[PDB]
A paper describes a structure:
Here, we report four crystal structures of HsmtPheRS mutants, and extensive MD simulations for wild‐type and nine mutants to reveal the structural changes on dynamic trajectories of HsmtPheRS. Using steady‐state kinetic measurements of phenylalanine activation and tRNAPhe aminoacylation, we gained insight into the structural and kinetic effects of mitochondrial disease‐related mutations in FARS2 gene.
Author numbering: 11 to 415
């Protein structure tokens, strides 16, 4: 912890919100999504190719400009306010974000760029980048992952171009908001935008996974879209959400300068997609540099089909860690950072298997079961003991927790 943070050549004074970790910092700028041949870059190029094809292939398809090198450091206004996220919304919890301070943060999603790009006059674009969130620790969650945003605007004439008396139809009106549309949108408009959205995503998935993937649309919520959806893909007997989307909140589109227009947007988890497309077991493999893994994504063209062969799964070592939280001063996702710092990518997952308050003291006890597993080799009991003991001492010094063990 400190007084000034220096990130990407810029300086940020620290305050009550500051909670960025040196570990996260060592990863900012990495840009896996722009790394030639990396599984993520691969998915990026394939999505890009699809959009390009569609532009040249169909007259109605617009040209999508692509931005994959925007700095992840944004203002809380870009990441939250511009997307209409309430001041008291849980997604703002310091516990789930990496804030430099009260006004700047590492983006939690690529949607943080929607407003500025809209304000710049663009009608169709894609933003691809690393995003950051403080989350639990397991093979499916990492503090850093990547997303690809897409925004598509429609003018009234463009939307109803294929309808006989379409110029008589409108985009806007003043009714009420319902489960199916916004208060200022016509059902006519929404039905067409929604259909375009789903057809676009469905075709993209078809291009990425082939005609023989099981997908389902699920209704959800986002403060920046409505109606909103999550597309899920059934993989290994299990419906997994791979993207979020919907019809852009008109207030957002209006404040950016495009009253005129109505649009849709979506944000899809490149990791999630990659893990499904190539089986990848574990999110941590995206960050290793074991050429048993990377060498498998060295294709002649992004069209050559990678036939990923999962590495061996080495034995894990499991150790529990208990302690006392301080006096009303502690967060779960905190200890999770001490863990990422000390155990790094050696930790496969952390589980809070138990927690209780002592009557006398008033002083809550936490017991975490940490699974230590190397993605590249067999960890010995010895080295794990050393990492586990360092985590133990660190907890006691830098989480005011008491050595209960």
């Amino acid at each position: 912890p400190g007084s000034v943070v220096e990130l990407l050549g810029k300086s940020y004074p620290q305050d009550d919100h500051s909670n960025l970790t040196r570990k996260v910092l060592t990863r900012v700028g990495r840009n896996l999504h722009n790394q030639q041949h990396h599984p993520l870059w691969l998915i990026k190029e394939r999505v890009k190719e699809h959009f390009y094809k569609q532009y040249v292939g169909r007259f109605g398809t617009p040209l999508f400009s692509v931005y994959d090198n925007l700095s992840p450091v944004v203002t809380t206004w870009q990441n939250f306010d511009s997307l209409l996220i309430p001041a008291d919304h849980p997604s703002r919890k310091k516990g789930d974000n990496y804030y430099l301070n009260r006004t700047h943060m590492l983006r939690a999603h690529t949607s943080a760029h929607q407003w500025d790009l809209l304000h710049a006059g663009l009608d169709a674009f894609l933003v691809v980048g690393d995003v950051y969130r403080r989350d639990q620790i397991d093979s499916q969650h990492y503090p850093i992952f990547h997303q690809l945003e897409a925004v598509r605007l429609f003018s009234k004439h463009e939307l109803f171009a294929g309808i006989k008396d379409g110029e008589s139809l409108q985009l806007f009106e003043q009714s009420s908001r319902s489960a199916h549309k916004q208060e200022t949108h016509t059902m006519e408009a929404v039905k067409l935008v929604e259909f375009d959205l789903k057809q676009t995503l469905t075709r993209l998935m078809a291009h990425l996974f082939g005609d023989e993937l099981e997908i389902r649309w699920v209704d959800c919520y986002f403060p920046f879209t409505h109606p909103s959806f999550e597309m899920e893909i059934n993989f290994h007997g299990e419906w997994l959400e791979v993207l979020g989307c919907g019809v852009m909140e008109q207030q957002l589109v209006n404040s950016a300068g495009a009253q005129d227009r109505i649009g849709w947007a979506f944000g899809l988890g490149l990791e999630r997609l990659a893990m499904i497309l190539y089986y990848i077991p574990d999110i941590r493999l995206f960050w290793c540099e074991d050429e048993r893994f990377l060498k498998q994504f060295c294709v002649s063209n992004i069209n050559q089909k990678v036939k990923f062969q999962p590495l061996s799964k080495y034995p894990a070592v499991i150790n529990d860690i208990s302690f006392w939280l301080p006096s009303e001063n502690y967060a779960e996702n905190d200890f999770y950072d001490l863990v990422r710092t000390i155990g790094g990518d050696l930790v496969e997952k952390v589980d809070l298997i138990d927690k209780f308050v002592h009557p006398k003291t008033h002083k809550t006890s936490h017991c975490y079961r940490i699974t230590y597993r190397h993605m590249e080799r067999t960890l010995s009991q010895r080295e794990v003991r050393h990492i586990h003991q360092a985590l133990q001492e660190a907890a006691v010094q830098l989480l005011g927790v008491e050595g209960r063990f």
